[model samples]
Target: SDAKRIEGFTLSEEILKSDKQLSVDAQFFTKPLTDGMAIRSEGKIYFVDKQASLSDGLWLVDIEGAISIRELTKLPGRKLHVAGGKVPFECGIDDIKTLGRVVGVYSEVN
Candidate 1:
């Protein structure tokens, strides 16, 4: 994002470079992995959003509190829906911590 310039992090060059082609050489990784339970530890990893508009889509939210991340979707009524495979659940957005929409994980989990 051109919003701010934090040390060791800038949106201009990095975002353009990775706008499509992820530089695995830089050890990049992130995303809202659906099957992280076996792939990771809780069917999830982590990621950044790169400052985008809020809309309907998968999002990494801190709803469980204290850094607990989950793959979620925003309902039309502005509620949160979490993936539980065949039995997903929904909750209010009173405690949702938006960490931006996920889409990364180039270096990958090994």
Candidate 2:
């Protein structure tokens, strides 16, 4: 439930879950969750990495300490180009690989 803020940041009690408090190495450090929705039924963490701009790519973190990163959509990036085909784009849940799967889609009406 906890992770380091950055790739090389130090691990701290405030940033990590109580279980990982003893493991304080940088390599052992984990990036904290910036945004996500918790699924109680599966006991898994589902989230979107808007920063990566890869839409339909859902991240899964389970209670048993397993992490799986998979693409849910192929065309997840911005549906339209920014600044007349310039600038960065955003991805949505519909971009995922399969249909009707568990994932978050981006909004098209940007």
Candidate 3:
């Protein structure tokens, strides 16, 4: 009877050890990501809705000559210009490849 009881205790110990390893593995996979109400990826952070339009906020523009950010506007036949006259040239609507409106900016203070 004593030997049989020892075998049961050994089995219980092995099961408890396996459960602990599983808990550690779960913690490793459940690490939290950066907090934001936007989609995060390797390239950019996106916050635009499906129906993106003018007057939206910062926009990621891919023009034929360059890729840059252009302030959203509602006017037609107007060229896209960088903020503060930073870029030397202008971009037209026909040159755009993709546009994503930026609603929030993330930066490290220090």
Residues 32-93, candidate 2, lDDT per residue (tens digit)?
Answer: 33332222122232223323443333433221232323333344243421111224343443
lDDT of 2: 0.29
Displacement of residue 76 (Cα, Å) in model 2 is 9.6
TM-score, predicted candidate 2 vs. hidden true structure = 0.22
RMSD of 3: 19.8
| Model 2 ranges with Cα > 4 A deviation | 1-29, 43-52, 59-71, 75-110
Best by TM-score: 1
- Please provide, for model 3 over 1-110, each residue's C-alpha lDDT reduced to its tens digit, 9 standing for 90 to 100: 11111000111211211111111111221332122123332234333232345553566555554544556443356645445235445466555544456554433442
Candidate 1 CA-lDDT value: 0.42
Predicted candidate 1 versus true structure: per-residue lDDT over 23-77, tens digit per residue: 1222232332322211112333334453634555555445544333346767777
lDDT to native, each model: 0.42, 0.29, 0.37
